[PDB]
């Protein structure tokens, strides 16, 4: 069986981008992927995406702008204090500018910069840049 | 090579274990 | 899609319909579909085969879709229909069929024992039963005062 469905989906979505493919089809599909995709889209990394809800499985078909440099998930999904954010911010993110080290917070799901603006935080879900 | 060694180790083990056995 | 378990060969590419409500080009009433299920169960056909007959003959691919809504706590699909009438086996059709077959091998080993392959198969079948049984205990299709062993298996079959 799979686990971390987001990791797999991200791993595909990045490998997709690396190729320069027109669109992506991610077969195993979720809230984790879809909420992350909606936060990704909201920043502008991806274009439009449609999910047909098949009686078997959602499929997401994601448009690739070409803006994503890398998007993958975080192996343990560690807990990280808002004071620890800055440690993580240098490690993972390529610069101060990019600021999607997606964290899931009390507020709902936010990017890294959006997580900051409210101020709040939680367990590390993934990154986008 | 590797045969050399196995028989040396076995001769060492068996003569020495003979000296253990006949020290036994 | 596939998974290699006691083989390196992929699993069948077959799929369900992606249908989510049913043909109205196929037509049966709730009263009529319960009757079809019950009749086939009476024969001694099992619930897998019962649906097989209903898809080929009566043109109904999966029960769930056709029936419910008619009582929308959950789907009305073959062993549920049967559970309400009291026609269900208490043991689940998954667990029953695995066990039965396991008793049949044993008999071959008895007259014949010099089998590498058949012997090994007995290991394989039993291990699946441990997993299938361990989860069922928790959910309540099997009490927790049970445990799996091969005389206890011959006692269920017989």
């Amino acid at each position: 069986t799979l686990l971390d469905p987001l990791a797999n989906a991200l791993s595909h979505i990045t490998n997709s981008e690396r190729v320069g493919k027109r669109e992506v089809y991610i077969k195993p599909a979720s809230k984790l992927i879809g909420e992350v995709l909606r936060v990704m889209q909201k920043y502008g990394y991806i274009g439009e995406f449609e999910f047909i809800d098949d009686g078997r499985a959602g499929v997401y078909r994601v448009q690739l702008l070409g803006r994503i440099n890398k998007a993958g998930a975080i192996k343990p999904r560690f807990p990280v204090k808002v004071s620890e954010f800055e440690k993580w911010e240098k490690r993972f993110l390529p610069a101060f500018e990019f600021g999607i080290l997606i964290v899931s917070t009390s507020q709902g799901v936010m990017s890294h910069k959006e997580a900051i603006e409210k101020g709040i935080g939680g367990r590390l879900i993934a990154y986008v840049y | 090579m590797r045969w050399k060694w196995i028989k040396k180790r076995i001769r060492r083990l068996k003569r020495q274990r003979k000296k253990e056995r006949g020290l036994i | 899609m596939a998974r290699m378990h006691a083989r390196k060969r992929g699993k069948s590419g077959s799929k369900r319909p992606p249908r989510t409500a049913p043909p109205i080009w196929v037509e049966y009433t709730v009263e009529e579909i319960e009757n079809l299920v019950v009749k086939l169960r009476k024969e001694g056909y099992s619930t897998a085969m019962i649906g097989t007959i209903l898809r080929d003959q009566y043109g109904i691919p999966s029960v769930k879709l056709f029936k419910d809504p008619d009582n929308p706590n959950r789907n009305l699909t073959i062993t549920r229909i049967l559970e309400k009438h009291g026609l269900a086996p208490e043991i689940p059709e998954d667990l029953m069929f695995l066990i039965r077959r396991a008793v049949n091998l044993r008999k071959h080993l008895e007259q014949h024992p010099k089998d590498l392959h058949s012997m090994r198969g007995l290991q394989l079948i039993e291990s699946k039963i441990r997993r299938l049984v361990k989860y069922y205990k928790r959910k309540g299709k099997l009490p927790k005062n049970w445990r799996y062993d091969p005389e206890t298996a011959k006692l269920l079959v017989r």
Partner: protein, 145 residues
């Protein structure tokens, strides 16, 4: 996975993994046990005095031939035989047999000698509690008994 568990609860597995995998270092395994302290005599000490049993010369290594000046000493408290290599040219002349001698390691305590010397683990600093490097130069101090 590349190898090691990663799970929030899993941490003990990693904690044990490193300690076990750490011992694969000889030097780490050695100091922690105290195989360094115990084995190469001294009792871990920086130096030791001993009495000169005799002056012996040892031959040089695979390229080399030369009679290197050495003292066989007996360390006092320890009560062990050490072979200790005398520095400076003229040096062996100053060491009178049965004087008090102070002995140090040379070039890692690890057991390794200089390349040229075979068995010698050690250095001789002192004769009758004045160092050889002093005795090399005429003016400074000049020896006794």
């Amino acid at each position: 996975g590349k190898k090691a568990p990663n799970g929030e609860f899993a941490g003990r597995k990693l904690k044990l993994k490193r300690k076990k995998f750490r011992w694969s270092d000889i030097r780490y395994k050695r100091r922690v046990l105290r195989l360094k302290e115990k084995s190469d005599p001294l009792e871990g000490a920086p130096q030791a005095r001993g009495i000169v049993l005799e002056k012996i010369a040892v031959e040089a290594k695979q390229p080399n031939s030369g009679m290197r000046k050495a003292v066989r000493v007996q360390l006092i408290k320890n009560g062990k035989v050490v072979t200790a290599f005398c520095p400076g040219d003229g040096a062996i002349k100053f060491i009178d047999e049965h004087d008090e001698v102070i002995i140090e390691g040379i070039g890692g305590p690890k057991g390794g000698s200089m390349g040229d010397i075979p068995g010698i683990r050690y250095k001789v600093v002192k004769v009758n509690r004045v160092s050889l490097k002093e005795l090399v130069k005429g003016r400074k101090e000049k020896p006794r008994r």
